[PDB]
Amino acid sequence: CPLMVKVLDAVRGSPAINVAMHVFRKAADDTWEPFASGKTSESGELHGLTTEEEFVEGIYKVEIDTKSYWKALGISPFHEHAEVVFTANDSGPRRYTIAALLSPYSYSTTAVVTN
Amino acid sequence: CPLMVKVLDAVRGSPAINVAMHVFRKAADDTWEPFASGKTSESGELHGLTTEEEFVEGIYKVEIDTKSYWKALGISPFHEHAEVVFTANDSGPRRYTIAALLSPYSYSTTAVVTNP
Amino acid sequence: CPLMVKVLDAVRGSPAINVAMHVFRKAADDTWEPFASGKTSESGELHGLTTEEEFVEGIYKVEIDTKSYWKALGISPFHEHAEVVFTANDSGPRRYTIAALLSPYSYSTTAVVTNP
Amino acid sequence: CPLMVKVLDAVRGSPAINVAMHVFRKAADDTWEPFASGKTSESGELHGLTTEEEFVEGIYKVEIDTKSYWKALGISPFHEHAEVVFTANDSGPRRYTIAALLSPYSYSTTAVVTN
């Protein structure tokens, strides 16, 4: 898997578990084509979204349903979702780990791109 | 103003100047309609995007063109843009300051919401 | 002022009001000497800590009492405090804005350094 | 190991490798007693700092030498170091992962506390 997403909860100090997200690829008509989704594990991770053959160069969006997470906890959130939009593989296939750290009125997202 | 955006550069320790952004509002047919746009000033701030009367309840998206900012400084960053999507004014008018803190492979965004 | 600190609350989307902090300056004998202190205002800002003449070159530490802030809101946070340690004015006088963004198990801190 | 530290580099999109840090425990005279140190691995992690028996309740500081890291990269940094100060184990032994995300003029630190 060349794409993994990890989500953490800055209020509880924990992995953010059962967070849903969808991954889209930008089509030629500039619309977002869904192609993968899942929800984070007990470790806050979502693995197995795609394969090296399928994950070709292009622009991808990860839309993380943070609002449902905060709703489940009874805490009023600001954002509808956290969106991470990036071009992949522009220099060849890489492993991408996208990390998101969530608070009700703020989030951070980082990419760690390795070999 | 009821909506202000501030952008900071975490590599240089400075305001992020001349950063373009576009704001959109979700229409009744679920499409993103253009709402306003502008570029940050020398203080990293963009003021005057809207007015209290125009900024009605709805779902708004701010798309901040962080990629062009980094490319002009010679850096090829990870993100295409930083997007902030939120419901505004659901419990009456509020003032929103969106802050974005930028690095080449990371950004943070925060909102400070005040009751006018 | 040459040194300003701004503190924001990422749980409530608000300035972090009445947050205490102490500033220290490293002495010639390598101990931390008291330099200034104060609490944030209703805007989450603490101004007036020092002056251009007093704020000489050196290593400064700002210790922000984030634990008391969260405890007064009913939260038992992870950190005892947020500490910001930095060399100031090494290439002549600068203006420093330190920003801290607080959550119960996380904080971020940023500096914006401007040449007066 | 009840204490692990992970450091990431927000400029390069990578683990922050060979970052030195020291862990201190606050003594009865309010001074900081060193007790563990190390440098991060190729994955940006530092494991094996302490043991469950030794890591008793108390106030601990992790001082991460971020300034040497940025110096090694030729990039002017703001902070002398990143300090993480916390009380441990106040409700019994936990596993603590301290994460730090570094930029030249900013850092973030988070704690994930699990079982």
Ligand SMILES: CC(C)=CCc1c(O)cc2oc3cc(O)c(O)c(CC=C(C)C)c3c(=O)c2c1O
């Ligand atoms: C593939 C590799 C060497 C690291 C990818 C990776 C990871 O495997 C675990 C991680 O745990 C983390 C746990 C945290 O509490 C945390 O704050 C981060 C940094 C995420 C931010 C502040 C956007 C990370 C983080 O970036 C991170 C992370 O980037």
Ligand SMILES: CC(C)=CCc1c(O)cc2oc3cc(O)c(O)c(CC=C(C)C)c3c(=O)c2c1O
């Ligand atoms: C003097 C100047 C051009 C900017 C200094 C400055 C400021 O005057 C106000 C600010 O408000 C902020 C409000 C926020 O919600 C916010 O998230 C930031 C970013 C700083 C973090 C994530 C620690 C800042 C921020 O860094 C900031 C900031 O750096």
Ligand SMILES: [Cl-]
């Ligand atoms: Cl932010």
Ligand SMILES: [Cl-]
């Ligand atoms: Cl603000």
Ligand SMILES: [Cl-]
């Ligand atoms: Cl962090």
Ligand SMILES: [Cl-]
């Ligand atoms: Cl983790």
